[PDB]
């Protein structure tokens, strides 16, 4: 009969978790003795406690969390083991010590630091051949950084390992401007057009973003000052990305597999409500209760692979 299983999305309008919550319901929809009870967090730990709450309440057999604050595991933890109720973490990925204080905890994610190094991989590539990009014909590589939400897991990962692989490969970079911008393109609109308003902004020769929401409001900050020869790096490659890349716009993004996590996510969830064990019946390699999805570079020489077919 049917099975109840409850969802919370941090936020319904950041970007690529809004492509991760339309995989998930339409492969709900694929399973006909499953219901889903959504929720909006509207970027709120206090307001998701209060709907695990709600849930936990209406009888669910797995909840499937995708946390405001990746520090507040602990929390649903507690509440969810009071009802012996499994849950599948997502997207925000808990201490490992947290996972490990409940036996039917699971995190579906990915390796966040693969996504920094691949993305500056990316930027070495197109660096080395656009060597009109080195404005002041220095040898490095003068960089603004649009940081995501300071402590979540890709954030700091993408932040520190972009840099870390461009000076492994033996470029030098030098940090102009470092300022978080939520994951937000509003936010990161109004940081970028202070960037170029001030005494820096004649110096800027790479703008890298941990996302592609970020990417574009950076985008759109450089076409109104007439700066558009100016490259933005991104993550994600939502598909109103590509069409930048397309375009010209953005250089170079990473797909991050929306499809996959969506997948994984809702499979471990209806395995666990069924009572069948983790990865039944299906092809997910767990590893001490974990999934991590590959992610995979992407610009101009293979985009036709990711874009529109
Ligand atoms: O947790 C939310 C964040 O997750 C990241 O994986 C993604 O790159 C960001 O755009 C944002 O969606
Ligand atoms: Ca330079």
Redesign the pocket.
């Given at each position: 009969a049917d099975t109840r299983i409850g969802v919370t999305i941090?936020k319904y309008d950041?970007?690529?978790?809004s492509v991760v919550r339309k995989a998930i319901e339409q492969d709900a929809k694929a399973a006909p003795d499953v219901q889903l009870l959504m929720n909006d967090s509207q970027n709120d730990q206090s307001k998701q406690n209060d709907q695990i709450d709600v849930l936990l309440a209406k009888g669910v057999k797995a909840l499937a969390i995708?946390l405001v604050d990746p520090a507040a595991a602990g929390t649903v933890i507690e509440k969810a083991r009071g009802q012996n109720v499994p849950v599948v973490f997502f997207?925000?990925e808990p201490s490992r010590k947290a996972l490990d204080s409940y036996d039917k905890a699971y995190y579906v994610g990915?390796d966040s630091k693969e996504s920094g190094i691949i993305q500056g991989d990316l930027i070495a590539k197109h660096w080395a051949a656009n060597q009109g990009w080195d404005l002041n014909k220095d040898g490095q590589i003068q960089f603004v950084l649009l940081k995501?939400e300071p402590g979540?897991p890709?954030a700091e990962a993408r932040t520190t390992y972009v840099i870390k692989e461009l000076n492994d490969k033996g470029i030098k970079t030098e940090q102009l401007q470092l300022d978080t911008a939520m994951?937000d393109t509003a936010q990161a609109k109004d940081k970028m057009d202070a960037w170029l308003s001030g005494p820096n902004a004649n110096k800027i020769e790479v703008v890298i973003a941990?996302?592609?929401?970020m990417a574009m409001g950076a985008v759109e900050a450089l076409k109104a000052h007439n700066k558009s020869s100016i490259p933005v790096f991104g993550?994600?490659a939502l598909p109103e990305a590509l069409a930048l890349v397309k375009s010209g716009a953005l250089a170079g993004t990473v797909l991050?597999d929306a499809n996959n996590q969506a997948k994984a996510t809702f499979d471990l969830a209806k395995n666990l409500a069924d009572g069948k064990g983790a990865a039944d019946g299906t092809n997910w390699k767990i590893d001490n209760k974990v999934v991590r999805v590959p992610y995979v570079g992407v610009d101009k020489d293979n985009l036709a692979e990711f874009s529109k077919k």
């Open positions: 941090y950041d970007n690529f978790m995708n997207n925000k990915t995501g979540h890709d994951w941990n996302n592609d929401a993550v994600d991050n």
